[PDB]
Amino acid sequence: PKSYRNYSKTARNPKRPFEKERLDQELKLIGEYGLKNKREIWRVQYLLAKIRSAARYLLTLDEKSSKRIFQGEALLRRMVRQGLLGENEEKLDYVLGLTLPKLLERRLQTKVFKLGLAKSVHHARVLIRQRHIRVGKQMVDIPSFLVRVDSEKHIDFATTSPFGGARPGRVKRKSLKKQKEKTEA
Amino acid sequence: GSLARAGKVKNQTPKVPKLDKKKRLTGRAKKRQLYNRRFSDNG
Amino acid sequence: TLFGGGRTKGFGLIYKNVDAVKKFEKKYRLVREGLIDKETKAGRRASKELKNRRKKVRGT
Amino acid sequence: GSGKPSGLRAARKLRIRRRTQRWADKSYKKSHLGTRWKSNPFRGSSHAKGIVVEKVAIEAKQPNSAYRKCVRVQLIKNGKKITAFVPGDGCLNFIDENDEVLVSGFGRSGHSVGDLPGVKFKVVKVARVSLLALFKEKKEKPRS
RNA sequence: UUCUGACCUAUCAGCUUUUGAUGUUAGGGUAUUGGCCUAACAUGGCUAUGACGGGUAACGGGGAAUUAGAGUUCGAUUCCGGAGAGGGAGCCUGAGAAAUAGCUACCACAUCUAAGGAAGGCAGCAGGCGCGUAAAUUACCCAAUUCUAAAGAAGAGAGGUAGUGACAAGAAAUAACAAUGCAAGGUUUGUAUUGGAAUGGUGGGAAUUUAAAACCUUCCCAGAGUAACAAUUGGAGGGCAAGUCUGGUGCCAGCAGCCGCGGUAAUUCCAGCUCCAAUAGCGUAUAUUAAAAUUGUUGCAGUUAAAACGCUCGUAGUUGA
C-alpha cells in the first residue's frame, strides 16, 4: 500500500501574472519584510484566503447556530493566540479586517528586528539562519516562524551561541590570534 | 531542391567570447537591491 | 538530544531484579546492552536444504 | 420556457435535446469519436520514436516567404510518415540522412502551426541526444 | 434474494419461443429457493418511460480534479465488493476452493533427455526479455505491525528497514556587519575599496539512534573572502513585466501559441551587452478543468450575422381556467 501520510500545497500565483500593480506591491512587501520569494507572499495570501473563507462562512451563517458559534469562538481564540487580533477585536468584521503586513509582522525575523536584536529584517533573517536566537529557551533557525502572543516576551539570543558567550565559534581563528600574538611578544 | 542555404547566419556571423564578470547578487539580496534601485528618484 | 541541545527526551524501563530481566525481556534490547551472537541464523539456505529432503534422504 | 420546456416532468426532453445537440462542437467531436486514436499517429502520447525518410525545405506562406528546414519522418511504432520541424538553422545539417528521431506535437494538438504548411510536429531529440542541447551550447554528446 | 440507481449508440425497431422463451402442473436435481433439470399442458413474455442489438482507450463503489453557484472532467491505482491467475473444461481434498507456488485432459506455449522417457506455468518478490515516449535492488531483517502451528522463544518477499528516486509536498543557502569612498538629503539616510565577528554544506571522531546498519539530532575536532565552497531558465514591438542598446546577416538564414519581424541605415534573426520575471527550480509537449451565459436547469442564439420543419392534421410527449 501507499503511505497514508497527508501532504498539501502552500501557494499559487493568480491569473494575469504580469499585473503591474500587483507586482509592484509584492516587490515592496519583499523589500520591507525581508522575504526571499513571491512564494513567501503567496503562502501568507493562502493563510489570509483561508481566514477570508472561514470569515465568509461565519458571517453568512446566522446568530444562534452551533457550528457558527463554535467555529467563530475557536477562530477568534486562535487568532488572539497567534496575535493577529487586537484587544477588543472579537467580532467577524475584524477577522475580515486582517491585512498582509500584519501576518508578516508575526514572523520571527520581523520581531527580532522590532526588538532590536538585529538592525534590519534581512539581518534578523541571517541571524536566525546562523543559529543565534532562542524563543523561550528553544533555538530555532526558521525566519518564517510565526510568533504567538505569549511567546513575544520570551525572545532572546541563544546562550549556546558565541553571542551567548559559551565559546567563540571560530576557536581555530581565536586560537591562531592568541598563539601568534604570544609567539611574537 | 533548395536545401543549399541551410545553417547560414550562425556560421556567417562574427562570434566573440562574453568576457569574464564577477558573480551576481541573488534572492532576497538582489530583490532588496532592486527595491532600493527602482523606487527612490528617477533622475 | 533535541534541536539546540541541553535537554534530551527518551524512554526507560527498570526491572525488579536480574531474574525479571532474564524471564521477561527479549533479545534485541539485551544485544544492544552487550549480548553477543543471534544463534543458528543463516537465512534461506536452510529452506533450500529442507525442501530438497523428503522421507530421510539425509537427516539434514 | 422560451425555446425550452419549463415542464416538471420535462427533464426527459432537456436531457435528450442536450445529448443530441452536444455533438455539433468540433472539440467534442474530436474527443468522443474514435478517429482520434485512428488517424493521429501519436495516439495519446506526446512523443514517439521515428526514422528520417527525407530532409525537405518547405516554403513559408506568402507574406512570410522563406524555405523552412524540415524532416519527413516515419514513426517506428505505427509505421506512418509525418512531417516534422527541425528547430535551429545548423541542426538540419547536424541531423543524419537515416537519423533515429524523437518527435513530438508542436503546440497546437494536431492543428497546423504558424506560416508552415503541412507541419504539425517537431523533432526534439535526435539519436536520443537533445536537439535543443546541440543548438544551445553544442552540449550533449554528439553521435556516440 | 427485494427495491432503487449507469457511459455512448436509431446510418440498430420490433425482439424472445425447434433448442425453456413466458406461465401452470407433476417430478428430478441441489445445501436450499429457483426452467436449476425433465415430462406434460397452456401461448405467452418483453419493447420509445428506447426493448432487442452494436460501441466503449468500460471492473463497480467509497472517491480525485476543477469548482461563486449550478456543473464539467476523472476514478488500473492505499479501504470495500466483484472478476481473473496462458485459454477453455473437468475433477480431487477439505468446514470452506470449480483453488491454479492443488491436480487431470485438450488446445496455445515450453523445459531437461543418454532422445528409451521425464518433469512445467512471475498478472507473488527481486531481476531479465519483448514491448515501447515511459518506470528502482536478484539488498537486510522479522525488532515493530499482524498472521499461520502441537501457538512465548518458530516461521512469514504479508509486513518492516534500507538502496535507487528533481513523481508529487513542506522547510531552506548562495551571506550578514562596521569602516572609509560614493549618492542624494543639511549635518542626516541610501550605496568601489578595505577587515574583524558569525555560519552551515564538505572531511573525521564519539554521544546517540538502530533488528543490525544508515539517516536525524547533540557534543568535540577539522573548516570560506573573488565567502572560485561560482544559479539557472525564458524573455525585453504588441498581446505582456524589460532596450527607438552594439555589431553581423539582407523574404536569405531564420525566429515567433497569436498578431508579426527579415526582401540593405533589423529594437523581433545570429551573437555580445544591459534590463526583466520566476527561482532550486524553470521550460516543452500531450492529456484534462477553468476560461466558456462558445451546449446555456440556473443561463445562449434563430428579421439582416449560424439557425422557424413549404404548409396543416395527429398518436406518443410536455403543458392544461
PDB file of all heavy atoms in Angstrom, chain E residues 35 102 104 150 152 281 302 314 316:
ATOM      1  P     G E  35     -39.032 -23.458 -10.905  1.00  0.00           P
ATOM      2  OP1   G E  35     -40.429 -23.189 -11.349  1.00  0.00           O
ATOM      3  OP2   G E  35     -38.852 -24.601  -9.964  1.00  0.00           O
ATOM      4  O5'   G E  35     -38.144 -23.764 -12.197  1.00  0.00           O
ATOM      5  C5'   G E  35     -37.880 -22.739 -13.178  1.00  0.00           C
ATOM      6  C4'   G E  35     -36.630 -23.064 -14.007  1.00  0.00           C
ATOM      7  O4'   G E  35     -36.815 -24.266 -14.803  1.00  0.00           O
ATOM      8  C3'   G E  35     -36.329 -21.953 -15.041  1.00  0.00           C
ATOM      9  O3'   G E  35     -34.902 -21.716 -15.253  1.00  0.00           O
ATOM     10  C2'   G E  35     -37.089 -22.447 -16.264  1.00  0.00           C
ATOM     11  O2'   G E  35     -36.612 -21.892 -17.478  1.00  0.00           O
ATOM     12  C1'   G E  35     -36.823 -23.912 -16.171  1.00  0.00           C
ATOM     13  N9    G E  35     -37.778 -24.696 -16.927  1.00  0.00           N
ATOM     14  C8    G E  35     -37.392 -25.541 -17.936  1.00  0.00           C
ATOM     15  N7    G E  35     -38.381 -26.234 -18.435  1.00  0.00           N
ATOM     16  C5    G E  35     -39.480 -25.816 -17.707  1.00  0.00           C
ATOM     17  C6    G E  35     -40.787 -26.356 -17.660  1.00  0.00           C
ATOM     18  O6    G E  35     -41.234 -27.268 -18.360  1.00  0.00           O
ATOM     19  N1    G E  35     -41.567 -25.734 -16.699  1.00  0.00           N
ATOM     20  C2    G E  35     -41.155 -24.695 -15.902  1.00  0.00           C
ATOM     21  N2    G E  35     -42.063 -24.219 -15.068  1.00  0.00           N
ATOM     22  N3    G E  35     -39.929 -24.191 -15.926  1.00  0.00           N
ATOM     23  C4    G E  35     -39.136 -24.829 -16.803  1.00  0.00           C
ATOM     24  P     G E 102       1.161 -26.146  -5.010  1.00  0.00           P
ATOM     25  OP1   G E 102       0.422 -25.448  -3.926  1.00  0.00           O
ATOM     26  OP2   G E 102       1.626 -27.528  -4.713  1.00  0.00           O
ATOM     27  O5'   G E 102       0.326 -26.182  -6.355  1.00  0.00           O
ATOM     28  C5'   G E 102      -1.114 -26.189  -6.400  1.00  0.00           C
ATOM     29  C4'   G E 102      -1.708 -27.556  -6.053  1.00  0.00           C
ATOM     30  O4'   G E 102      -3.030 -27.315  -5.487  1.00  0.00           O
ATOM     31  C3'   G E 102      -1.987 -28.516  -7.221  1.00  0.00           C
ATOM     32  O3'   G E 102      -0.801 -29.286  -7.525  1.00  0.00           O
ATOM     33  C2'   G E 102      -3.144 -29.356  -6.684  1.00  0.00           C
ATOM     34  O2'   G E 102      -2.706 -30.424  -5.863  1.00  0.00           O
ATOM     35  C1'   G E 102      -3.935 -28.341  -5.894  1.00  0.00           C
ATOM     36  N9    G E 102      -5.064 -27.810  -6.679  1.00  0.00           N
ATOM     37  C8    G E 102      -5.238 -26.502  -7.072  1.00  0.00           C
ATOM     38  N7    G E 102      -6.326 -26.320  -7.772  1.00  0.00           N
ATOM     39  C5    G E 102      -6.898 -27.575  -7.845  1.00  0.00           C
ATOM     40  C6    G E 102      -8.118 -27.986  -8.434  1.00  0.00           C
ATOM     41  O6    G E 102      -8.945 -27.267  -9.004  1.00  0.00           O
ATOM     42  N1    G E 102      -8.291 -29.353  -8.337  1.00  0.00           N
ATOM     43  C2    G E 102      -7.438 -30.224  -7.730  1.00  0.00           C
ATOM     44  N2    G E 102      -7.759 -31.499  -7.860  1.00  0.00           N
ATOM     45  N3    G E 102      -6.334 -29.841  -7.092  1.00  0.00           N
ATOM     46  C4    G E 102      -6.116 -28.517  -7.206  1.00  0.00           C
ATOM     47  P     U E 104      -1.096 -33.553 -12.984  1.00  0.00           P
ATOM     48  OP1   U E 104       0.091 -34.441 -13.162  1.00  0.00           O
ATOM     49  OP2   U E 104      -0.877 -32.113 -13.305  1.00  0.00           O
ATOM     50  O5'   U E 104      -2.333 -34.080 -13.824  1.00  0.00           O
ATOM     51  C5'   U E 104      -3.034 -35.302 -13.488  1.00  0.00           C
ATOM     52  C4'   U E 104      -4.254 -35.505 -14.407  1.00  0.00           C
ATOM     53  O4'   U E 104      -5.401 -34.774 -13.869  1.00  0.00           O
ATOM     54  C3'   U E 104      -4.136 -35.025 -15.861  1.00  0.00           C
ATOM     55  O3'   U E 104      -3.431 -36.005 -16.658  1.00  0.00           O
ATOM     56  C2'   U E 104      -5.566 -34.690 -16.254  1.00  0.00           C
ATOM     57  O2'   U E 104      -6.285 -35.803 -16.749  1.00  0.00           O
ATOM     58  C1'   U E 104      -6.120 -34.166 -14.937  1.00  0.00           C
ATOM     59  N1    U E 104      -6.070 -32.674 -14.860  1.00  0.00           N
ATOM     60  C2    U E 104      -7.067 -31.963 -15.479  1.00  0.00           C
ATOM     61  O2    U E 104      -7.968 -32.491 -16.121  1.00  0.00           O
ATOM     62  N3    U E 104      -6.980 -30.610 -15.336  1.00  0.00           N
ATOM     63  C4    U E 104      -6.038 -29.894 -14.647  1.00  0.00           C
ATOM     64  O4    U E 104      -6.135 -28.670 -14.579  1.00  0.00           O
ATOM     65  C5    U E 104      -5.003 -30.695 -14.062  1.00  0.00           C
ATOM     66  C6    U E 104      -5.050 -32.029 -14.196  1.00  0.00           C
ATOM     67  P     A E 150      -2.711 -26.012  16.854  1.00  0.00           P
ATOM     68  OP1   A E 150      -3.864 -26.946  16.707  1.00  0.00           O
ATOM     69  OP2   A E 150      -3.048 -24.626  17.284  1.00  0.00           O
ATOM     70  O5'   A E 150      -1.665 -26.603  17.906  1.00  0.00           O
ATOM     71  C5'   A E 150      -1.860 -27.915  18.499  1.00  0.00           C
ATOM     72  C4'   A E 150      -0.639 -28.444  19.316  1.00  0.00           C
ATOM     73  O4'   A E 150       0.095 -29.489  18.565  1.00  0.00           O
ATOM     74  C3'   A E 150       0.452 -27.406  19.672  1.00  0.00           C
ATOM     75  O3'   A E 150       0.856 -27.470  21.060  1.00  0.00           O
ATOM     76  C2'   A E 150       1.535 -27.660  18.634  1.00  0.00           C
ATOM     77  O2'   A E 150       2.789 -27.152  19.019  1.00  0.00           O
ATOM     78  C1'   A E 150       1.487 -29.159  18.540  1.00  0.00           C
ATOM     79  N9    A E 150       2.208 -29.676  17.353  1.00  0.00           N
ATOM     80  C8    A E 150       3.144 -28.982  16.610  1.00  0.00           C
ATOM     81  N7    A E 150       3.592 -29.643  15.573  1.00  0.00           N
ATOM     82  C5    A E 150       2.920 -30.846  15.639  1.00  0.00           C
ATOM     83  C6    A E 150       2.954 -31.975  14.805  1.00  0.00           C
ATOM     84  N6    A E 150       3.711 -32.030  13.693  1.00  0.00           N
ATOM     85  N1    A E 150       2.188 -33.030  15.152  1.00  0.00           N
ATOM     86  C2    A E 150       1.438 -32.957  16.253  1.00  0.00           C
ATOM     87  N3    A E 150       1.308 -31.940  17.108  1.00  0.00           N
ATOM     88  C4    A E 150       2.060 -30.890  16.726  1.00  0.00           C
ATOM     89  P     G E 152       2.229 -20.725  23.206  1.00  0.00           P
ATOM     90  OP1   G E 152       2.690 -21.875  24.035  1.00  0.00           O
ATOM     91  OP2   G E 152       0.872 -20.178  23.497  1.00  0.00           O
ATOM     92  O5'   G E 152       3.311 -19.566  23.250  1.00  0.00           O
ATOM     93  C5'   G E 152       2.970 -18.227  22.839  1.00  0.00           C
ATOM     94  C4'   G E 152       4.188 -17.276  22.848  1.00  0.00           C
ATOM     95  O4'   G E 152       4.751 -17.103  24.191  1.00  0.00           O
ATOM     96  C3'   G E 152       5.373 -17.741  21.964  1.00  0.00           C
ATOM     97  O3'   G E 152       5.990 -16.627  21.274  1.00  0.00           O
ATOM     98  C2'   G E 152       6.272 -18.421  22.983  1.00  0.00           C
ATOM     99  O2'   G E 152       7.596 -18.539  22.516  1.00  0.00           O
ATOM    100  C1'   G E 152       6.124 -17.463  24.141  1.00  0.00           C
ATOM    101  N9    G E 152       6.610 -18.022  25.410  1.00  0.00           N
ATOM    102  C8    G E 152       7.534 -17.393  26.212  1.00  0.00           C
ATOM    103  N7    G E 152       7.821 -18.070  27.299  1.00  0.00           N
ATOM    104  C5    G E 152       7.039 -19.219  27.201  1.00  0.00           C
ATOM    105  C6    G E 152       6.950 -20.349  28.063  1.00  0.00           C
ATOM    106  O6    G E 152       7.565 -20.508  29.124  1.00  0.00           O
ATOM    107  N1    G E 152       6.035 -21.286  27.595  1.00  0.00           N
ATOM    108  C2    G E 152       5.341 -21.192  26.415  1.00  0.00           C
ATOM    109  N2    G E 152       4.537 -22.201  26.127  1.00  0.00           N
ATOM    110  N3    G E 152       5.415 -20.139  25.610  1.00  0.00           N
ATOM    111  C4    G E 152       6.281 -19.205  26.044  1.00  0.00           C
ATOM    112  P     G E 281      12.310  23.660  -5.140  1.00  0.00           P
ATOM    113  OP1   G E 281      12.038  24.818  -4.241  1.00  0.00           O
ATOM    114  OP2   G E 281      11.984  22.316  -4.573  1.00  0.00           O
ATOM    115  O5'   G E 281      11.526  23.812  -6.529  1.00  0.00           O
ATOM    116  C5'   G E 281      11.115  25.102  -7.041  1.00  0.00           C
ATOM    117  C4'   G E 281      12.005  25.688  -8.182  1.00  0.00           C
ATOM    118  O4'   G E 281      13.219  24.914  -8.458  1.00  0.00           O
ATOM    119  C3'   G E 281      11.358  25.812  -9.568  1.00  0.00           C
ATOM    120  O3'   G E 281      10.354  26.860  -9.580  1.00  0.00           O
ATOM    121  C2'   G E 281      12.596  26.064 -10.426  1.00  0.00           C
ATOM    122  O2'   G E 281      13.110  27.370 -10.262  1.00  0.00           O
ATOM    123  C1'   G E 281      13.560  25.054  -9.834  1.00  0.00           C
ATOM    124  N9    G E 281      13.517  23.768 -10.552  1.00  0.00           N
ATOM    125  C8    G E 281      12.957  22.591 -10.105  1.00  0.00           C
ATOM    126  N7    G E 281      13.086  21.600 -10.958  1.00  0.00           N
ATOM    127  C5    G E 281      13.783  22.160 -12.022  1.00  0.00           C
ATOM    128  C6    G E 281      14.320  21.551 -13.187  1.00  0.00           C
ATOM    129  O6    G E 281      14.227  20.362 -13.509  1.00  0.00           O
ATOM    130  N1    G E 281      14.964  22.469 -13.997  1.00  0.00           N
ATOM    131  C2    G E 281      15.112  23.800 -13.726  1.00  0.00           C
ATOM    132  N2    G E 281      15.752  24.494 -14.650  1.00  0.00           N
ATOM    133  N3    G E 281      14.644  24.384 -12.618  1.00  0.00           N
ATOM    134  C4    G E 281      14.018  23.507 -11.808  1.00  0.00           C
ATOM    135  P     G E 302     -31.453  35.881 -31.379  1.00  0.00           P
ATOM    136  OP1   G E 302     -31.514  37.247 -31.979  1.00  0.00           O
ATOM    137  OP2   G E 302     -32.381  35.638 -30.236  1.00  0.00           O
ATOM    138  O5'   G E 302     -31.677  34.758 -32.486  1.00  0.00           O
ATOM    139  C5'   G E 302     -31.106  34.856 -33.804  1.00  0.00           C
ATOM    140  C4'   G E 302     -31.692  33.798 -34.763  1.00  0.00           C
ATOM    141  O4'   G E 302     -31.497  32.450 -34.226  1.00  0.00           O
ATOM    142  C3'   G E 302     -33.192  33.906 -35.051  1.00  0.00           C
ATOM    143  O3'   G E 302     -33.447  34.878 -36.111  1.00  0.00           O
ATOM    144  C2'   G E 302     -33.557  32.467 -35.432  1.00  0.00           C
ATOM    145  O2'   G E 302     -33.295  32.253 -36.804  1.00  0.00           O
ATOM    146  C1'   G E 302     -32.609  31.640 -34.577  1.00  0.00           C
ATOM    147  N9    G E 302     -33.254  31.029 -33.402  1.00  0.00           N
ATOM    148  C8    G E 302     -33.081  31.380 -32.079  1.00  0.00           C
ATOM    149  N7    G E 302     -33.737  30.601 -31.250  1.00  0.00           N
ATOM    150  C5    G E 302     -34.370  29.686 -32.085  1.00  0.00           C
ATOM    151  C6    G E 302     -35.120  28.519 -31.772  1.00  0.00           C
ATOM    152  O6    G E 302     -35.413  28.110 -30.645  1.00  0.00           O
ATOM    153  N1    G E 302     -35.535  27.855 -32.911  1.00  0.00           N
ATOM    154  C2    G E 302     -35.248  28.229 -34.195  1.00  0.00           C
ATOM    155  N2    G E 302     -35.738  27.447 -35.133  1.00  0.00           N
ATOM    156  N3    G E 302     -34.543  29.315 -34.504  1.00  0.00           N
ATOM    157  C4    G E 302     -34.109  29.962 -33.413  1.00  0.00           C
ATOM    158  P     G E 314     -55.778  17.696 -34.727  1.00  0.00           P
ATOM    159  OP1   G E 314     -57.163  17.515 -34.210  1.00  0.00           O
ATOM    160  OP2   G E 314     -54.921  18.608 -33.927  1.00  0.00           O
ATOM    161  O5'   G E 314     -55.018  16.330 -34.857  1.00  0.00           O
ATOM    162  C5'   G E 314     -55.591  15.048 -35.118  1.00  0.00           C
ATOM    163  C4'   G E 314     -54.512  13.958 -34.996  1.00  0.00           C
ATOM    164  O4'   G E 314     -53.483  14.096 -36.032  1.00  0.00           O
ATOM    165  C3'   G E 314     -53.753  13.861 -33.684  1.00  0.00           C
ATOM    166  O3'   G E 314     -54.523  13.084 -32.741  1.00  0.00           O
ATOM    167  C2'   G E 314     -52.393  13.296 -34.086  1.00  0.00           C
ATOM    168  O2'   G E 314     -52.409  11.886 -34.188  1.00  0.00           O
ATOM    169  C1'   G E 314     -52.188  13.917 -35.456  1.00  0.00           C
ATOM    170  N9    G E 314     -51.432  15.183 -35.379  1.00  0.00           N
ATOM    171  C8    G E 314     -51.989  16.432 -35.463  1.00  0.00           C
ATOM    172  N7    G E 314     -51.136  17.406 -35.360  1.00  0.00           N
ATOM    173  C5    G E 314     -49.928  16.768 -35.193  1.00  0.00           C
ATOM    174  C6    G E 314     -48.639  17.327 -35.080  1.00  0.00           C
ATOM    175  O6    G E 314     -48.371  18.530 -35.054  1.00  0.00           O
ATOM    176  N1    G E 314     -47.673  16.356 -34.977  1.00  0.00           N
ATOM    177  C2    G E 314     -47.886  15.016 -35.021  1.00  0.00           C
ATOM    178  N2    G E 314     -46.770  14.325 -34.954  1.00  0.00           N
ATOM    179  N3    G E 314     -49.108  14.450 -35.093  1.00  0.00           N
ATOM    180  C4    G E 314     -50.076  15.390 -35.204  1.00  0.00           C
ATOM    181  P     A E 316     -51.957  10.050 -27.197  1.00  0.00           P
ATOM    182  OP1   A E 316     -52.715   9.453 -26.060  1.00  0.00           O
ATOM    183  OP2   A E 316     -52.071  11.527 -27.334  1.00  0.00           O
ATOM    184  O5'   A E 316     -50.408   9.682 -27.036  1.00  0.00           O
ATOM    185  C5'   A E 316     -49.954   8.364 -26.648  1.00  0.00           C
ATOM    186  C4'   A E 316     -48.426   8.176 -26.849  1.00  0.00           C
ATOM    187  O4'   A E 316     -47.997   8.465 -28.217  1.00  0.00           O
ATOM    188  C3'   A E 316     -47.420   8.952 -25.968  1.00  0.00           C
ATOM    189  O3'   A E 316     -47.320   8.437 -24.615  1.00  0.00           O
ATOM    190  C2'   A E 316     -46.148   8.858 -26.779  1.00  0.00           C
ATOM    191  O2'   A E 316     -45.537   7.590 -26.635  1.00  0.00           O
ATOM    192  C1'   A E 316     -46.701   9.054 -28.180  1.00  0.00           C
ATOM    193  N9    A E 316     -46.777  10.468 -28.521  1.00  0.00           N
ATOM    194  C8    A E 316     -47.902  11.238 -28.667  1.00  0.00           C
ATOM    195  N7    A E 316     -47.644  12.485 -28.935  1.00  0.00           N
ATOM    196  C5    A E 316     -46.258  12.543 -28.941  1.00  0.00           C
ATOM    197  C6    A E 316     -45.355  13.612 -29.089  1.00  0.00           C
ATOM    198  N6    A E 316     -45.794  14.852 -29.348  1.00  0.00           N
ATOM    199  N1    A E 316     -44.025  13.340 -28.966  1.00  0.00           N
ATOM    200  C2    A E 316     -43.657  12.082 -28.716  1.00  0.00           C
ATOM    201  N3    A E 316     -44.411  10.984 -28.626  1.00  0.00           N
ATOM    202  C4    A E 316     -45.713  11.301 -28.695  1.00  0.00           C
TER     203        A E 316
END
